[PDB]
């Protein structure tokens, strides 16, 4: 069964916009914007543990990703936890500075095959 699509409650002001709150929202979009890191963390976590996309970690990651996608329409920050960060990256990424670990999943097999083909 698919995940629920129930979004966050809308935030309605008691007065009209004074052209300053829109600027505050625009500036605040730069901070607490974890849209790009949630997908990478989910991919890394799915690569690491077996029976991927079945544990509660993947469900929480999907919920956070949906909330972050909905952040553009409703002002609800994603609030990415610190303990959910990957801290490890597979071989098929451009994060050379970050620690790189050998991946043994289907993506790792594809990367090994393409490396053997190009070499």
């Amino acid at each position: 069964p698919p995940m629920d699509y129930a979004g966050s409650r809308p935030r309605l002001m008691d007065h009209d916009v004074t052209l300053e709150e829109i600027h505050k929202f625009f500036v605040d979009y730069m901070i607490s914007d974890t849209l790009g890191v949630i997908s990478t963390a989910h991919l890394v976590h799915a690569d690491r543990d077996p029976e991927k996309a079945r544990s509660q970690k993947c469900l929480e990651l999907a919920n956070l990703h949906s909330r972050a996608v909905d952040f553009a329409k409703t002002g609800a920050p994603a609030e990415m936890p610190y303990a959910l960060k990957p801290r490890e990256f597979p071989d098929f990424l451009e994060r050379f500075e970050k620690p790189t670990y050998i991946s043994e999943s289907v993506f790792g097999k594809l990367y090994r095959a393409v490396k053997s083909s190009l070499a």
Binding site: S8, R9, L12, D14, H15, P81, A83
Partner: protein, 113 residues
Amino acid sequence: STMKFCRECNNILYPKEDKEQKILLYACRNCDHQEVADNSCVYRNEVHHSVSERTQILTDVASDPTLPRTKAVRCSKCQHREAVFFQATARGEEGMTLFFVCCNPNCGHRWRE
């Protein structure tokens, strides 16, 4: 709750209503002196519920209840499931929004719904 004394009799005045004059007057029962009233106010009391004097300390009246605690929501900065939830209005928003404050003594983090 407003008592005044006549300038001639120096006794307590009793409020009364005159049908012909249709005005508020004060008269004392000792001397026949009816003075004019000011502001047409005969009673004024600040509503206070301190009827149990010298008894609210021994007996827990529970005037300020404690906020409820839940163990379903999980905090972000720490992996602690216990948090307090309550409803309060925002700075400018209209309506009630559910808040969450982490109960971990070492976390001290609060967030919205």
